[PDB]
Design a protein around this ligand. Structure first.
Ligand SMILES: *[C@@H]1O[C@H](CO)[C@@H](O[C@@H]2O[C@H](CO)[C@@H](O[C@@H]3O[C@H](CO)[C@@H](O)[C@H](O)[C@@H]3O)[C@H](O)[C@H]2NC(C)=O)[C@H](O)[C@H]1NC(C)=O
Ligand SMILES: *[C@@H]1O[C@H](CO)[C@@H](O[C@@H]2O[C@H](CO)[C@@H](O[C@@H]3O[C@H](CO)[C@@H](O)[C@H](O)[C@@H]3O)[C@H](O)[C@H]2NC(C)=O)[C@H](O)[C@H]1NC(C)=O
Ligand SMILES: *C1O[C@H](CO)[C@@H](O[C@@H]2O[C@H](CO)[C@@H](O)[C@H](O)[C@H]2NC(C)=O)[C@H](O)[C@H]1NC(C)=O
Ligand SMILES: *[C@@H]1O[C@H](CO)[C@@H](O[C@@H]2O[C@H](CO)[C@@H](O)[C@H](O)[C@H]2NC(C)=O)[C@H](O)[C@H]1NC(C)=O
Ligand SMILES: *[C@@H]1O[C@H](CO)[C@@H](O[C@@H]2O[C@H](CO)[C@@H](O)[C@H](O)[C@H]2NC(C)=O)[C@H](O)[C@H]1NC(C)=O
Ligand SMILES: *[C@@H]1O[C@H](CO)[C@@H](O[C@@H]2O[C@H](CO)[C@@H](O)[C@H](O)[C@H]2NC(C)=O)[C@H](O)[C@H]1NC(C)=O
Lengths: 322, 175, 175, 322, 175, 322
């Protein structure tokens, strides 16, 4: 007689697959659902560069830490990248108020521009160029934050400062200032004449009065004094008024800012690689299509769901067993 | 295989066939060979591809998100976030894994199903004009050629033609 | 359809039938007509309804919840919440979509299965007292009427009755 | 010979359904799983009305903003509805302490009743009926929050206030008070004689001392002064003691409050429609049964899970193809 | 049962059988008895166990977590956490319940499938050397003994041996 | 003729199972997936005991509440267990700053040891052994927190305290201090001579100045005065300086602390049962294997997902129907 026989394909494939009821099943064709490849660099998010502070904290950068720079004349960014432990933070020891909140606000910026709000030389009846310490060494010469001024008494006098700035720009503006909390009463008189002192700042919103807190503390970068910093967004048509009797660290520069979206600060020791993704990782970018990845939990972007496994291998073909 | 196909009557699948996924293997008086079936193989490729795609395409909700941001006096909140991230990882990890497991199973059964379909289409097309071997093979009660098996694939096999050639050839084997 | 039913031997389903979901169509010497099967159709309705319900009723955990509440000095927390809401949206959206996809498939196969069940119940009830056409149809070796087909639906068809009427009628067609 | 043929139903349905392996499949009968219908009104939650502040913030309401009313003489509510940007907030510019927390506390209340704690006329040796400003214009006449009193010096004197109230009701009661932070020293003396000033409030829990903060600020509704408010729950048997030398904005009314559960503040521009649901939405109520909806994420109640899709259509019948 | 097995041709399963899950029941000229099938029963146990395990083992992501921690000026955040906990409960509760429902269904069908597999293996091994009763039972055209049914289980039944004993015995019953 | 019949197993099982399409299906064998058994005691997490404060709040414990003890000379723990409403908290009424955050920090500790930081007898020119009240009755004799000293004027004098401690240990150390907020001016003078008063504490981090707040309050444990407490982690090489004029509650003891992980505070009325788990519950431990439990939501450990149901019963065998 004559025959016909029905059969199925089989090839030289050795790729295994798992089943609800069976393990290590040899299959004709298979498809990995799980992304495992990254590119080991930092990239633009949707064609917008990150802000990569190299050895600086955000604080370090915003205040002018002498060892950081103001070279971050990048007008716009999509996310910020700090190192694990940036080396350049507050050269002069101190504190920064609502730092994290400020960091979050700054994580993604549509426009950012540095403006000389109160110019270093307009302090006619106070000493502007002397507030300088070995805690912030610039080039062997001792120094201090660039974007902020440490005012000292002129002659043996510190007149009450009364001074304000109208935001006549259209952009919101971020403004910063600080107090010096000296170590002791002598140190007070030496820097500012007056024993009792205050800074008061008012906005349409802000209503603060700082008062220096004198106390023996431990030296930090050789300094037992402390610097405490403060900020706000000054709204387009508003005005900020400062008034001090003196422990005042005056703004010099402030930032025009246009904020149109949030992101986060990423921690990575990687460097920029001219490059773009829709999804970024402290270990590198992902050119995603898979709905799952196992690279790293702390992503930024439109990413595959992060998963804890090595294999998500889906069966295309059939039971290809020798 | 559930449908008596792969683990069943058809022990092993022909490697000799490159044409497609499913097919035939004749041994007529000209020679022998295997040409795969097309509407079947095609409908399968479509189906599997479609499954793969929908598994990818139905997540097409994801959107912008991020990394990690509280100071060490906000530890309770850091913990809150951890748990949340952790919890999502547990959800997705479990779902993905089981999804794959379940769908892999249904896939391998889907193939078995089609094989049995194909077997049964042939079987019915030619009732007692052929012998059911059990190897997943059919033997003809009559003689057959190459052009003969085209209608077999086509679905245009004519029963009343070779019926009385089989019918008499059937009684000859009987006793 | 996987079970050789819908995409298989029964090409197209009778619109002429309103009675139920599954059924028969006779063409005896009185006339012709279609009365649906009931235990089958009934068991299916039950099953589909049940599937729909359990898909609804098994969520019967949800409970009181809300909208959104932090000032613009708590933006990190607002973000925390966004993620969380966002993440649940991604989970539920994905699950629901695939749940539907998967269960829809199993449903259409469930119907095919039952059809083939019904086909095979008839088939076995009357071994060689009937001819297997391949259209999903059976031709009787003997003559049959309306009351005759009641036992066919019933499951009370008697084989040894019309056997020798078939047996002789079978050899008449042979050669 | 004679025939029987097995077949399946088919009707004039054109409703399509999707499958893991197939798209656009025509089906006999189908069931939508996804709720899409709302009724565009705000309704009671389980037969409990919401509190719909019309043009008032919660703050505006609680303090008596003149343009708001005290007509919110509804005793009980299930959730609150503020507008996106209520027009009537703090007519006199200022701040409110733990405002959100208090909003959250107030979002759902079992009983609420306004009680005269310290009568506006019991201030014999201070001026009660003068603390009034053009920032809170009532009917052309200028004025001030109703539920709170802005005490001014009588003759040229502001005796130290010592004053307390025992909560002798059974209900917790919510109490509110403020400081005035004047613009300058002259303004201080004008309103209150004494240059140095304080308010101190004590409970079995609260232990505060406020001190007005003088500073040049920008005018807001024509005022560069500020009002800062504060609150607590005064427990049934307890007592709150006020003492001031004077920048004191004294309670007149406080609120009996019974809290038996939480909800949230909803933001909607809709109005009440006499009506009930188990689930509400800023765009309207949902008479839910489906396990999924796509109307709006910000719900209140027992809701179908909110989902991102248009079709969750489940196959009832079979392959009804022409 | 979907495959015509449990709810179908085999009405009721033999309690008399302790050997395994699936098996045979002979009634030859020596006596009668039931010895279960082993490769089948074994492959099933394997499968079911495996399903149970993977359902357990694939969660093997979970890890360290906790209870609850905000004061009553942090109620908004307490609510944030509630929502999240609540939301996970709604996810897990729903999935687990439906997982069980779906997989239970597939299990009971998996058994039906194997039964029909076993039925069809026997059926094909001995084409027309046996009668198809419809009770899920086969009657031999020839006589048979105990050693006879070993090859039947084995898969070593020889068709061309008892063919002409059946063939003549078949015509004797005919008319 | 002769027969063979194919059949399936059936036994005397009556365990039901549910199906997507079918309810109450009788089955041959079945497996419960859902854990419901706990052991009703508290156990070590991975061989590390919990800290079970019996009738004490953490505050009560950390400060030396006389009714608590310092017997908690357990050097390490994995989680803390407080009761619902511990009886022994702040015997002297008052407040504890960042209490929750401290609780959280303490929930799991690698090493913990109590060190005498500023010894009770080194107060030569102040009264150390007098700061005692009936609010903290010890054995009928009235008394006060053990780990902290309430300094009073000697003769009729309270010299300005200037005093510091260098952390010369390798471990971080947790330090605590308080202010006393007297009821009135007379009470001030009585305890400390000086009418105007401050405590200032400085770290390389901490820069605080406290000022007592005088006010009529309600008696609590017969006391209308109040005690406010504060804390920090003093870093290995750092130093804390205190300076007070006097309302100072001086540390006596502080804690060395090594933190290598977090957990939480569990609320339970249960007692220790010598015993171990990987997963604990206020109602008892779970020896988990199942991926789901329904015991209790507030777990600590590596637990099965908590679920709302009684049955997760999976079919092993087949349709075993009589
Ligand atoms: C910062 O300076 C700006 C600009 O000088 C101040 O806003 C200005 O204030 C003027 C005059 O007060 C405003 O003009 C006013 O407009 C309304 C109608 O809109 C009119 O009825 C008034 O009579 C008045 O003319 C306007 O907002 C703006 N001036 C212009 C021409 O742009 C702002 O007040 C300053 N910041 C603060 C808070 O002091
Ligand atoms: C807390 O007390 C410890 C005591 O060990 C202090 O650490 C010590 O600090 C001194 C400086 O104050 C260091 O001495 C220095 O050593 C170099 C030579 O090695 C010498 O030329 C200098 O004259 C200088 O004084 C010493 O290295 C250091 N010892 C240790 C063990 O680290 C610590 O500074 C105290 N905390 C503070 C900031 O008060
Ligand atoms: C507020 O007054 C209430 C109501 O009278 C006081 O409660 C009574 O006070 C006495 C005095 O100690 C106690 O016997 C009971 O606590 C209360 N008696 C009754 C019959 O209620 C309460 O003391 C006052 N609160 C304060 C802070 O003084
Ligand atoms: C199932 O197959 C995989 C093959 O990938 C097995 O994984 C093994 O793990 C070793 C490391 O010990 C790898 O080097 C090999 O790929 C695998 N071993 C061998 C010899 O094949 C897995 O262990 C196999 N069986 C199961 C289910 O445990
Ligand atoms: C099958 O599904 C949808 C629904 O019918 C199709 O959407 C259509 O898009 C194409 C043009 O892109 C047109 O045929 C119809 O006008 C659209 N239908 C709608 C949404 O009204 C879908 O494209 C169909 N299949 C494909 C891939 O064409
Ligand atoms: C399926 O069977 C279960 C068996 O537990 C039924 O459970 C009963 O539920 C009722 C509620 O109406 C209780 O009063 C009984 O205590 C339970 N029965 C017993 C004694 O086992 C369940 O109701 C059944 N499902 C349905 C509704 O058919």
């Amino acid at each position: 007689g004559d025959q016909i026989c029905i059969g199925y394909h089989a090839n030289n494939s050795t790729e295994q697959v798992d089943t609800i009821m069976e393990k290590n099943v040899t299959v004709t064709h298979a498809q990995d659902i799980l992304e495992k490849k990254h590119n080991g660099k930092l990239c633009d998010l949707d064609g917008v560069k990150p802000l990569i502070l190299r050895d600086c904290s955000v604080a370090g950068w915003l205040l002018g830490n002498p060892m950081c720079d103001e070279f971050i004349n990048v007008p716009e960014w999509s996310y910020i990248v700090e190192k694990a432990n940036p080396v350049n933070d507050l050269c002069y020891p101190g504190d920064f108020n609502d730092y994290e909140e400020l960091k979050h606000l700054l994580s993604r910026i549509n426009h950012f521009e540095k403006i000389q709000i109160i110019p270093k030389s307009s302090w006619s009846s106070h000493e502007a160029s002397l507030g300088v310490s070995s805690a912030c060494p610039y080039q062997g010469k001792s120094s201090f934050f660039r974007n902020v001024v440490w005012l000292i008494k002129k002659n043996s006098t510190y007149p009450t400062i009364k001074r304000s700035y109208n935001n006549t720009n259209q952009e919101d503006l971020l403004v910063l200032w600080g107090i010096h909390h000296p170590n002791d009463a002598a140190e007070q008189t030496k820097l500012y004449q007056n024993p009792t002192t205050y800074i008061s700042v008012g906005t349409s919103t802000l209503n603060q009065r700082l008062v220096p807190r004198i106390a023996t503390r431990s030296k930090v970068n050789g300094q037992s004094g402390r610097m405490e910093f403060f900020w706000t967004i000054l709204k387009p048509n508003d005005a900020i008024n400062f008034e001090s009797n003196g422990n005042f660290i005056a703004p010099e520069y402030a930032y025009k800012i246009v904020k149109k979206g949030d992101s986060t600060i990423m921690k990575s020791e990687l460097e920029y690689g001219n490059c773009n993704t829709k999804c970024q990782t402290p270990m590198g970018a992902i050119n995603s299509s898979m709905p799952f990845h196992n690279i790293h939990p702390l992503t930024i972007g439109e990413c595959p769901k992060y998963v804890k496994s090595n294999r998500l291998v889906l069966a295309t073909g059939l039971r290809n067993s020798p | 295989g559930l449908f008596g196909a792969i683990a069943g009557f058809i022990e092993g699948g022909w490697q000799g066939m490159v044409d497609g996924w499913y097919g035939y293997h004749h041994s007529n008086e000209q020679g022998s060979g295997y040409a795969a079936d097309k509407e079947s193989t095609q409908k399968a490729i479509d189906g599997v591809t479609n499954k793969v795609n929908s598994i990818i395409d139905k997540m097409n909700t994801q959107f912008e998100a991020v990394g990690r941001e509280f100071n060490n006096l906000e530890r309770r909140i850091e913990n809150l976030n951890k748990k949340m991230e952790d919890g999502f990882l547990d959800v997705w990890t479990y779902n993905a894994e089981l999804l794959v497991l379940m769908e892999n199973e249904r896939t391998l059964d889907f193939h078995d199903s089609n094989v049995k379909n194909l077997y049964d289409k042939v079987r019915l097309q030619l009732r007692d004009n052929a012998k059911e071997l059990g190897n997943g093979c059919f033997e003809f009660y009559h003689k057959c050629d190459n052009e003969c098996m085209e209608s077999v694939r086509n679905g245009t096999y004519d029963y009343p033609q070779y019926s009385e050639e089989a019918r008499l050839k059937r009684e000859e084997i009987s006793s």
